């Protein structure tokens, strides 16, 4: 309920990523690690790279163990190859422990590291099932729970600023919190509502209904989880299956039709700008995702605002304009509840009880007329049928 030691231990932002400080090896080598609930490999740059200010030097760690085995990991965008081994790992602003964990030493990569992101590795927090080479490589959190008394769960509060941040600003500000082993009540308001983790591979959940300003998209619910629906702190946008994306964009365009935007905007590629302070938030609809509840035939809903799905970006011109990119895009691999969703809520990854909790975030961006919300319950039947097989 109270872990002041870990509150505000994250830095970063959408687009580039949210990261936590970790140390690896002996003596401790400090590295910034991206928090990624969408994968299960712990990996770190281990050789010079144009975008890396530092990297893992195995030859300088007295505790480094070479597993003599290579590993390859591809992501929706980006990929890397590395060499497997183990070493001692600690988290300065996390529990006071030291765990021996598997570490992939990245030796080659493509479209993975991000210039200026300030992170040098990735912490895959999902399950062994999707770890590479296979489920035999124990993920970091599994090691943590097995080697310590830290409870089997963590929570994330990702904080979007609501406006663009320059390099010095992102470096000097709080990007959020990752509470390891517990929940901190100062990070949310209202109550926590839980949805079942369908299966332990990605953090998969089941969406049972979608609304645009209260109006039902009215699609066969399997379409919403077509292939799957996951919660991923390593993805910026709310990504939706092709059919759902098209239906959603049609409805969002209709609700905001008093103003017309170019196709490039809806494709998530180009920005739309308004005179400083005049963004017409009210013309854009709220989006509600209903999730299966823990009680039979019960569901709840999470609702985000345009302040969540319109991502702030700096306008090239020295203009004092407020510009944004549409942060909802299509996916051919299922729904991805990325930062667009996570910046609106405090998310509890309760692995012990196989469930994910959502509560309104104490740091979500909004205005005087609307706020993000988590509400329930709703009598919903045959939710099990919403899952895709
Ligand atoms: C917040 C935040 C953090 C970061 C780094 N961004 C910017 O990058 C992305 O949003 N990257 C997405 C691609 S996009 C722009 O939606 O199309 C992405 O691929 N994120 C991955 C992490 C980054 C650091 C490479 C991962 O979070 C996505 C996840 C679904 C994934 O690809 N998992 C892998 C996977 O499923 N691989 C199989 C196929 C897709 C190669 C694992 C299981 C091996 N936004």
From Swiss-Prot:
Disulfide bonds join 159-363, 221-386, 273-323. The keyword Cytoplasm does not apply. Induction: Up-regulated by the Ca(2+)-regulated transcription factor NFATC4. It comes from the Eukaryota. It is found in: Cell membrane; Golgi apparatus, trans-Golgi network; Endoplasmic reticulum; Endosome. Its EC number is 3.4.23.46. The modification N6-acetyllysine is found at residues 69, 218, 222, 228, 242-243, 250. The keyword Acetylation applies. Belongs to the peptidase A1 family. Responsible for the proteolytic processing of the amyloid precursor protein (APP). Cleaves at the N-terminus of the A-beta peptide sequence, between residues 671 and 672 of APP, leads to the generation and extracellular release of beta-cleaved soluble APP, and a corresponding cell-associated C-terminal fragment which is later released by gamma-secretase. Cleaves CHL1. This is Beta-secretase 1.
């Amino acid at each position: 309920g109270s872990f002041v030691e870990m509150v505000d231990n994250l830095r970063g932002k959408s687009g580039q990523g949210y990261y936590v400080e970790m140390t690896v090896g002996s003596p401790p080598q400090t590295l910034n690690i991206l928090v990624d609930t969408g994968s299960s490999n712990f990996a770190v740059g281990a050789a010079p790279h144009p975008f890396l200010h530092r990297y893992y030097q195995r030859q300088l760690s007295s505790t480094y163990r070479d597993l003599r085995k290579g590993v390859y990991v591809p992501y929706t965008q980006g990929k890397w190859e590395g060499e497997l081994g183990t070493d001692l790992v600690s988290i300065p602003h996390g529990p006071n422990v030291t765990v021996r964990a598997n570490i992939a030493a990245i030796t080659e990569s493509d479209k993975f590291f991000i210039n200026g992101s300030n992170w040098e590795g990735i912490l895959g927090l999902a399950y062994a099932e999707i770890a590479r080479p296979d489920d035999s490589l124990e993920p970091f959190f599994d090691s943590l729970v097995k080697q310590t008394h830290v409870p089997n769960l963590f929570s994330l509060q990702l904080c979007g600023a609501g406006f663009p941040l320059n390099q010095s600003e992102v470096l000097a500000s709080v990007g959020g919190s990752m509470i390891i082993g517990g929940i901190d009540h100062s990070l949310y308001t209202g109550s926590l509502w839980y949805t079942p983790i369908r299966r332990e591979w990605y953090y998969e959940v089941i969406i049972v209904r979608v609304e645009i300003n209260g109006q039902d998209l009215k699609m066969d619910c399997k379409e919403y989880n077509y292939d799957k629906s996951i919660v991923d702190s390593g993805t910026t946008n709310l990504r939706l299956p092709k059919k759902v994306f098209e239906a959603a964009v049609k409805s969002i365009k209709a609700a905001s039709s008093t103003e017309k935007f170019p196709d490039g905007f809806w494709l998530g590629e180009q920005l739309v700008c308004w005179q400083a302070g005049t963004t017409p938030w009210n013309i854009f609809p709220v989006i509600s995702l209903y999730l299966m509840g823990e009680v039979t035939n019960q569901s709840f809903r999470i609702t985000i605002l345009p302040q969540q799905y319109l991502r702030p970006v700096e306008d090239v011109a020295t203009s004092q304009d407020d510009c944004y990119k549409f942060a909802i895009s299509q996916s051919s691999t299922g729904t991805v509840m990325g930062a667009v969703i996570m910046e609106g809520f405090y998310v509890v990854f309760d692995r012990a009880r196989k469930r994910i909790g959502f509560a309104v975030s104490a740091c979500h961006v909004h205005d005087e007329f609307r706020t993000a919300a988590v509400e329930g319950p709703f009598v919903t039947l045959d939710m099990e049928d919403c899952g895709y097989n």
